[PDB]
């Protein structure tokens, strides 16, 4: 709603595990201020694959060892795994190259899930001399 969404939080590449192919694949996940999560084929949002709710929607999120029914792809390590749970029930199988990345997503998500935004009236006002 709110005429869609305006403003991006983060945008990186993460490994997602498929169901029919049961294999990890490269995917670009981008979080919106509106409180939504959409991943497209590549950085360029041209062919939207899907869109899930983030605002008060994320039930839980695991990272690394936390994982229970997930395995790291080739090269990567268990110190990167990361899965997100949705209130709707369905979850999201992901895996960060490193633990750092995983945590970043876990925190960036957990927050947006339980943290609203003043989105409404703001100005780019900033520095001038320099």
Outline the fold blueprint:
Elements lengths: L7 E10 L6 E9 L3 E5 L7 E6 L4 E6 L17 E6 L4 E5 L3 H15 L17
Antiparallel strand pairs: 1-2, 1-7, 2-3, 3-4, 5-6, 6-7
PDB class: membrane protein
Keywords: PH domain, phret1, structural genomics, nppsfa, National Project on Protein Structural and Functional Analyses, RIKEN Structural Genomics/Proteomics Initiative, rsgi, membrane protein
Assembly: monomeric
Please give a structural write-up.
- This protein is mainly β and 130 residues long.
- The protein is built from one helix and seven strands.
- The chain has a seven-stranded antiparallel sheet with strand order 4-3-2-1-7-6-5, with helices on one face.
- β1 and β2 (24-32) form a beta hairpin.
- The longest helix has 15 residues, at 99-113.
- The termini are far apart.
- Keywords: Cytoplasm, Developmental protein, Membrane.
- This is Pleckstrin homology domain-containing family B member 1.
Number of helices: 1
So what's the oligomer here?
Answer: monomer
- Major beta sheet summary: 7 strands, antiparallel
Encode the helix/strand succession as letters: EEEEEEEH
Tally of DSSP β-strands: 7
Subunit structure: Binds transducins. Homodimer. Interacts (via PH domain) with MYO1C. Interacts (via PH domain) with MYO7A.
Domain PH: 8-114
Organism: Mus musculus (Mouse)
Protein name: Pleckstrin homology domain-containing family B member 1
């Amino acid at each position: 709603g709110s005429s869609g969404s305006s403003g991006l939080v983060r945008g990186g590449w993460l490994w997602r595990q498929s169901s029919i192919l049961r294999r990890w694949k490269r995917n670009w996940f981008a979080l919106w201020l509106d409180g939504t999560l959409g991943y497209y084929h590549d950085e360029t949002a041209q062919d939207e694959e899907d869109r899930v709710v983030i605002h008060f929607n994320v039930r839980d999120i695991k990272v690394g060892q936390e994982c229970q029914d997930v395995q790291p792809p080739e090269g990567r390590s268990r110190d990167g795994l990361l899965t997100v749970n949705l209130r709707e029930g369905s979850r999201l199988h992901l895996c960060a190259e490193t633990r750092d990345d995983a945590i970043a997503w876990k925190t960036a998500l957990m927050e947006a899930n339980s943290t609203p935004a003043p989105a409404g009236a703001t100005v780019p006002s900033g520095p001038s001399s320099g």
